[PDB]
Design a binder for these strands. Sequence first.
DNA 1: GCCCTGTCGCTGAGAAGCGTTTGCGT
DNA 2: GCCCTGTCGCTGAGAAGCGTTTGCGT
Lengths: 104, 104
Amino acid sequence: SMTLPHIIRPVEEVTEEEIRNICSNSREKIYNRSLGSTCHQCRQKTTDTKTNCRNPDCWGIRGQFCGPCLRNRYGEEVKDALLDPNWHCPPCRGICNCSFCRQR
Amino acid sequence: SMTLPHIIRPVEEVTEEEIRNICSNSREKIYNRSLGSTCHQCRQKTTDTKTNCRNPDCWGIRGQFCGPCLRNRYGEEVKDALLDPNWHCPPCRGICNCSFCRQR
DNA sequence: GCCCTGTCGCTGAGAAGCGTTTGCGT
DNA sequence: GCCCTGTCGCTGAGAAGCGTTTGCGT
Ligand SMILES: [Mg+2]
Ligand SMILES: [Mg+2]
Ligand SMILES: [Mg+2]
Ligand SMILES: [Mg+2]
Ligand SMILES: [Mg+2]
Ligand SMILES: [Mg+2]
Ligand SMILES: [Zn+2]
Ligand SMILES: [Zn+2]
Ligand SMILES: [Zn+2]
Ligand SMILES: [Zn+2]
Ligand SMILES: [Zn+2]
Ligand SMILES: [Zn+2]
């Protein structure tokens, strides 16, 4: 299988450092092929904090969104999403507008 | 990867025995977990001859249909499909009416 | 030029087959 | 009953991240 396992992170396990590491400008991202995480929207693998979809039916990394992409494409803040126990990713809500999902 | 490789069989390599082995009644199928092939429509893995999708963009076993399913669900004969160099499976044509594909 | 500082292309990827499985009531 | 002899449920499955990548011309 090519799919990375999806693990749901509880809201009470979100730390201050992770909140401070949410990207505020896409040009300031730090790339890392091993420790980074890929944002579903912009498809860049970087070390900034990204969202975690808490829908049990979600899979893979489709639920991971960076700071700028979540606010610019959906008007939501990553910090609010990380502290929301019922937050579902735009792919799970069927409203993703990335270049791949809006084709069909 | 869980996907079986898709191999396109040329029309000139279809033999008489394979044509004679096309299923004419679903109750007469012979099941075999190792040598059988799965029909996409009825999801039964049997030894009767099934279609081969010749679209290069096809993948997996979605293009394999048994005799009764092809004629009853799409009005096409497996023998005609096997001898058609440009035959595409109903999933490739977006007209599949199996229980999984017609949901969405 | 303006303010809200932003994004898509490409490769290879995209289940399969078991059990609980065989038409409609027009 | 009829003729054309038929089909769905369930489990686990359903990419990810590289390069060619950063708003519109209203
Ligand atoms: Mg391939
Ligand atoms: Mg069986
Ligand atoms: Mg009815
Ligand atoms: Mg799973
Ligand atoms: Mg790179
Ligand atoms: Mg324009
Ligand atoms: Zn992003
Ligand atoms: Zn999700
Ligand atoms: Zn998307
Ligand atoms: Zn079949
Ligand atoms: Zn096909
Ligand atoms: Zn189908």
